[PDB]
Write a protein that binds this ligand. Structure first.
Ligand SMILES: [Ca+2]
Ligand SMILES: [Ca+2]
Lengths: 355, 354, 354, 355
């Protein structure tokens, strides 16, 4: 079923229980998937939400940071993450032309709980472009779809491939979409968990590499129909500047699968940490204590977090491909990579299970 | 006398363009949609302002551009590609913090008919300030129709200031705030370029107000109080993406001179675009052109005059927003316009003379 | 001599610390080495200024730190790890542009004896401005011995200003420039923290000079002219690396108010460090400790008072440099000190009063 | 001799004549190698210089940009590169504690030619840490060594491994140091050349990857003694913001060999382009025309430059390892990877010659 279940092991680290971003305790994920056949008005899109906390994000801010490998994409809520490193909302993935509707729907969702608290809601919404398989000009994603994803957001196993925001996506000229993975550090390394959730929509066929092996080079013959957003989570107590460091390691994971070299690819990365809690919620005009006690991972412990994030992102992307299935829409056809076809290509270029 | 300069108050040392507005950069157009409706705590005092960077469709003639963030406690769309590639390919819009998404997706929808099978993803630039005091900002009352009204209203010439468009419900230095604009023209020996600024001023505490350097805020503390700033700089200088970033940061200088830039809570986000290069290729993925494009670059020994001009334009734009602001009562809060006669009196009191 | 505040000139609204200097941040030390030697075109008017962030060795008690660059037309060492990890682990030094390397490597050498098999690579912070008009800057006259002299002279208490240390041959607003310092203390209800600034001012055109907002430069154009600014901000507030970056950018605000920030040629580079967290681990690669360190963070509803204080401290520090500057004739160039009486006359002419 | 001569192909691209950064016309490289045994005062260090032009850099500035993957390192001259994107000097590599002496030596070198022109010289100097094999506290590099490297700077083949600045460096717990490589685009893509020169001093044994194959995993048994600076050059007419984009692709090449996950690693990248010439030399007080006509690579042509740079960086790193030999110094021993041992490790993980 998933990459690791095929005996394909990415990197050297050990996954958490679900091998998903939800292995970071409290983190929840929900999809809303739109699939409707209607000629050039066919809908192949949706929205994915990440809740950073067990409860409302506004009440328990997370330290966070962003890194942009290639900004050919759109996002909301990132400027305050750059400035103050505080994630105070859910995170959502959708298509390029639906970002605003999704963002303002997330704002409306906090209206009722705003008990006269003075603040301006700034949700984080990121995107990739499903213009080939989806009627992206049709702007078919609505607040109701955001509410369905929010209601479905839960811990445990996370559906992958052509679901939620990844529904109409294409990766390495195969079916793309949602992928997730995690790594758990050893006790002597802090015992922290690092998880990643990607929406993979990038890359040319020949460049595909799986566990390092040049599998793309022997997969050129397969028919082709012819951006990637990454969230990294960890329960390590990382400060804002450390979340920035962690986010950039998404470049490392993406590069190892064969990405990061396209002008057209919106490669935008976010990392948040749950280790520090009890951070002050924004409520302007209402002042608390001058300082807050927080914890910081010492820099001689942060490399094991970099390694883990890089692995989690790499496997998350390959998981997206493995979960991908055939899609025909609006006159375009994309094939799922195929579990057996991947195993065959791996063997052809010298990979073997348990070497 | 209506605007700052008309009162005999001169900001900086430079010479303004004909309208003393961002529209003094040829082809740049500005349009407002102003929303006013009384309904207790659901009162509407907000709207949208749009900037057209070109005489025609922004998509067909991209502008080099850059952003600078003095304090990112605010939201914006369309900025990541500006950072990456420095290309403005859409109109610019101002609105309130909770309407950014609706405005942005309305701007995406507006380009649908003209797309005609060209492959690209629309990424409009939308910025905001917070009108939560005078406006029902949780009400999300701005819609696509309001964006379409602002677009159709976009025009050259004089730009309405104060409580209009996106500035309708804004508050600055505890007076009425909102839209402000100004411009500077360089001498011919310096390239003859025009630099314009359009601000949505919603920042600042009373005591900090400075007009032409004079501490007028210190003698205006007695005036009743009801208790972010987005800046666009435009120029017809042929600035490259990295030069637009340099130009954008000079909004810090202008803002600082009026008494801003020291609030944690203030979304101070600046954008600068240049119209001097007008032969840039429109985005059309899958459709490949020639390897290179010849472009123009301002030499660095000519860019300082543009820095000065931008700083002065931003400074006067903010003071213009204040001078144009009028009294507003809404949702149980009252704010006073600074007042032309009152500003002159305060100026004289702290030693200023015409 | 008399400083700005002694002339009855008050910058901003805040209250200075005891020495009105960066040394008001407890433990911080400053030392100058001043080279002044008349020798025709080989005249030496330069030197080095050092800041010790701690009472003892910087390496043993790192400070959280951040940088902001308003205009990167200058050179600096040690900034990349400050950007990356926000850790100041060395003294800070100011000198001229062509002596940065010798000064940097001398600071490396200074830690050699204390290294005692500890595994790390020394990365001192060295910044500069250009004294090429009054100083034989191609002569590269600054050496390790001068760095040791500054180091040995580093102490708390009053800091000499003007044409001393790194500021010896510097020029500001076409008057004598150089070293300036100032501080602000927050009220107890605001955390009671101290914010200090030390600048080496070498920027600006005459007409642009503003003192306490008043446009004195405009009435000082007649004064003969001989024709970058590095800023360090310190605070005992417990600021995290990302917060030090925010604080550092407020040097843009202070600098703007005196009339800077609009020159392509000006290396305007700012560093801010905080001493509030003092239990940070010294770098020793290969020798690992506990997984985490508990630290303190200033809450964001308390950081605005720090922004204000930093901007005021930077502004007064620049004016302090000008006030302390005296006449210098060197290498065929003459620059005048602003002049205490001349400044007072100029201020009164444009409406200022004590 | 070199990686490609072993039948090992990195990426899909075609190298230039020298497979070196010198394949960008006019670019020159010179080494000064210090090797002296003297107990704990042994010298194993030096300096490498890059001339971006056939003549003096000051008189013909290059557009340039920087990217920092991990700023645990020191450099001079980068702030004006960030600000205005203008390279106006040679570039030098040395050890961490010699950066200042090398930089001021480069300033002094321009003195005679200054001839009353008003400017402040801001040379670009970068470093990695050779503290294990070299007496790095001894500060044994001087202006005379810089002058030797400058005089030795020439086009053509570039010596790799433990030479110049790479003399005492260590990579993946093998001998490290200088590596270089290049790629040439087809006439279809603009025909431009992309070159890279690295000083590789990073990485744990286990993570080493060659052409994707995880050879490090079967090389753990080899004895161990227990940063990377990259310059990318191209004759494409890249503007400063485009040079920044190109520089970040060093992250991709570095990631593919197994780097980018160490807190301790100063991973600092510079890219300059030679395509635009006649850029105005800095001479403050002496004013020219308001504008200059320059060229820009269109964004639908920049991806091939992205790919080329990532491939050149990757092969350059492996070239450094392949060129490395055994070194014993100051109580430490490091082994060269070994060409035959590498071919063996490659077969062990499924690699075979002849594609
Ligand atoms: Ca931080
Ligand atoms: Ca550029």
């Amino acid at each position: 079923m998933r990459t690791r279940d095929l005996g394909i092991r990415i990197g050297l680290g050990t996954p958490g229980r679900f091998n998903a971003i939800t292995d970071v305790p409290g983190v929840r994920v929900g999809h809303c998937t739109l699939n409707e056949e209607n000629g050039d008005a066919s809908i192949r899109t949706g929205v994915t939400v990440i809740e950073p906390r067990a409860g409302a994000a506004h009440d328990s801010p997370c330290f966070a940071g962003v890194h942009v490998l290639n900004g050919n994409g759109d996002a909301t809520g990132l400027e305050w993450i750059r400035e103050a490193g505080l994630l105070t909302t859910p995170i959502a993935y959708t298509n390029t032309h639906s970002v605003g509707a999704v963002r303002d729907a997330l704002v409306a969702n906090e209206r009722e709980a705003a008990a006269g608290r003075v603040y301006w809601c700034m949700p984080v919404v990121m995107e990739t472009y499903d213009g080939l398989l989806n009627d992206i000009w049709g702007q078919h994603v609505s607040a109701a779809h955001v509410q369905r994803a929010l209601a479905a957001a839960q811990t445990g196993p996370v559906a992958e491939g052509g679901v939620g925001g990844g529904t109409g996506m294409i990766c390495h000229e195969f079916k793309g979409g949602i992928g997730t993975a995690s790594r758990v550090l050893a006790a002597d390394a802090g015992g922290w968990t690092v998880g990643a959730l990607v929406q993979a929509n990038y890359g040319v066929r020949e460049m595909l590499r799986v566990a390092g092996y040049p599998v793309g080079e022997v997969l050129r013959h397969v028919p082709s129909p012819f951006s990637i957003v990454v969230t990294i989570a960890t329960d390590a107590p990382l400060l804002p500047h450390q979340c920035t460091r962690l986010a950039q390691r998404a470049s490392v994971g993406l590069a190892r699968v064969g990405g990061g070299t396209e002008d057209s690819s919106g490669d935008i990365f976010l990392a948040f940490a749950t280790g520090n809690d009890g951070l002050p919620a924004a409520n302007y005009g209402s002042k608390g204590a001058p300082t807050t006690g927080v914890k910081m991972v010492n820099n001689d412990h942060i490399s094991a977090l970099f390694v883990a994030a890089a692995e989690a992102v790499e496997e998350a992307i390959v998981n997206a491909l493995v979960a991908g299935g055939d899609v025909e829409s609006r006159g375009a056809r994309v094939e799922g990579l195929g579990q057996a076809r991947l195993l065959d290509a791996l063997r052809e270029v010298g990979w073997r299970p348990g070497r």
